[PDB]
Structure 1
């Protein structure tokens, strides 16, 4: 029976209003010395609010069901009287955010690699009926080899919250689909929008609808007047045009084919999907 005492704490990886993440190593038994990330949530901070309770249980249910190389792996999960524990794989490659900052602009082949892996993760989720919604550079980590991992399926990680009712808009909203910000109803097509926004950011240096402040950003996102810079390749321009459509049902990937439709686009013409999913493709950046 796994317990908190089975793990030795090595450092604090992060913290927020609901709990903390530690780097840990297993003290004894199987995988003695194996390194994990341990997320520890305070039930007291959660159980009084039906929405947060629900969100917590959905996080654990999603992470338990998902079996995919490009989504964070949940190893153990247990609780005590006052805390919930999630033992996750430790991801040493950092945030994709740090990669965009260091490079400014990705070469197309580098962008293509990361966007391809993300699309496979989104496809896995979508066929399970799960919508990611929060695709953004900060949310995308890299393992020690440099492969993509999607994270943040649970409670709010922000230190400053937007309003007092929901945590839906606490982060940057620069990658969020217009129909979410409009509260006009949405489905898995929001993820293909977010993929486009991320792609635009990789290849230009900034998300497509940024402004001087948040209001102006939201206004631009809702207005949806896409300007594609001339230096984009024909394949990139074409895909971005198809992903960043205001009308969800027109978006590439919104169709019945979902990720399959996006993956069939000429921007991804050189991707071998079997070798990619099997992690046999050398990543563009190696955290080593």
Structure 2
């Protein structure tokens, strides 16, 4: 019988209009002393269902869920490695082997989601956590983490849209192909220092993304350039990964040729950065 009193609050991990996340310590039971992330929501149904349905090394684990008063409590594994964002921000630009590692782990997580009919939509690097070893954990399954909200209804444009596919921005209907686009935008950000389509303002940024005139930096390897070219396409159906082979298609691309997927999945590959050493 789990209740809020079973946990002590340690610090705030994040707050927005639609929930708050705490680092907490369990103080009862066999897991006495163990550290978790606690998300509290004001009652969302998709979020819980998603987290209960997925089980994968590169996706955050849900340990407990319960509702007391009007609040929903989600107890997740505590991820101490921070946001992928912070590594990018410190490094400026990743070496290709660095980028390859992260993108490869993300692709497996995306594959798992898609098999469960789940679409991640937004792979901006603040939406990817690292665990204590430095491996990827997809975490962003909730409504919106913002405090100021675009549109008096839906939460597509609240944060940056720089990693979202044209067809999402147009609201013209979409599928799992948007995730492969977003993987490309993230990849582009890793290898060049900024997402592919940026404007002086929101309106300009939308227009650039819709026009999708890709600038392939010449200093990248041919494999990296070819993958970016095949991910960042306005025609969703014709992106790598958009076909029946999904993640398998992307993982077969020459940019990932040095990846042992079995070793990757089992997390036996050493991450480029170790959060414990930071």
Mark yes or no: TM-score above 0.5.
yes
Shift of 1:18: 2.3
Q: How has the CA–CA distance of structure 1 residues 216 and 235 changed in structure 2, closer, same or farther, with 3 Å as cutoff?
A: same
1:66-108 superposed Cα distances (whole Å, 9 cap, x missing partner) = 1101011100000012211000111111111111110010000
Shift of 1:266: 0.4
1:5-59 superposed Cα distances (whole Å, 9 cap, x missing partner) = 111111111111122111111102111101000111122xxxxxxxxxxxx0010
- The yes-or-no answer on 1:31 pairing with 2:19 is no
1:15 counterpart residue number = 15
Shift of 1:127: 0.7
- Cα separation, 2, equivalents of 1:146 and 1:8: 26
1:148-178 superposed Cα distances (whole Å, 9 cap, x missing partner) = 0111101210011112111122110000000
Determine helix, strand or coil for the equivalent of 2:82.
coil
Determine helix, strand or coil for the equivalent of 1:92.
coil
TM-score calculated relative to the size of structure 1? 0.94
- Cα separation, 2, equivalents of 1:161 and 1:146: 32
- Cα separation, 1, equivalents of 2:171 and 2:222: 33
- Cα separation, 1, equivalents of 2:203 and 2:85: 23
1:266 counterpart residue number = 254
- Cα separation, 1, equivalents of 2:170 and 2:75: 36
Shift of 1:239: 0.4
Shift of 1:187: 0.4
Shift of 1:144: 0.6
1:140 counterpart residue number = 128
Q: Which has the larger displacement, 4-13 or 275-284?
A: 4-13
Cα RMSD over matched residues?
Answer: 0.7
Determine helix, strand or coil for the equivalent of 2:195.
coil
1:257 counterpart residue number = 245
* Structure 1 segment 157-176 matched on structure 2, within 5 A: 157-176=145-164
Shift of 1:182: 1.4
- Please list every run of at least 4 consecutive aligned residues from structure 1 whose deviation after the TM superposition is greater than 6 angstroms: none
Determine helix, strand or coil for the equivalent of 1:141.
strand
Determine helix, strand or coil for the equivalent of 2:173.
coil
Unmatched tracts of structure 2, length 5 or more: none
Q: For this pair of structures, how many residues does the alignment match?
A: 275
Determine helix, strand or coil for the equivalent of 2:160.
coil
Determine helix, strand or coil for the equivalent of 1:155.
coil
- Cα separation, 2, equivalents of 1:186 and 1:113: 28
Unmatched tracts of structure 1, length 5 or more: 44-55
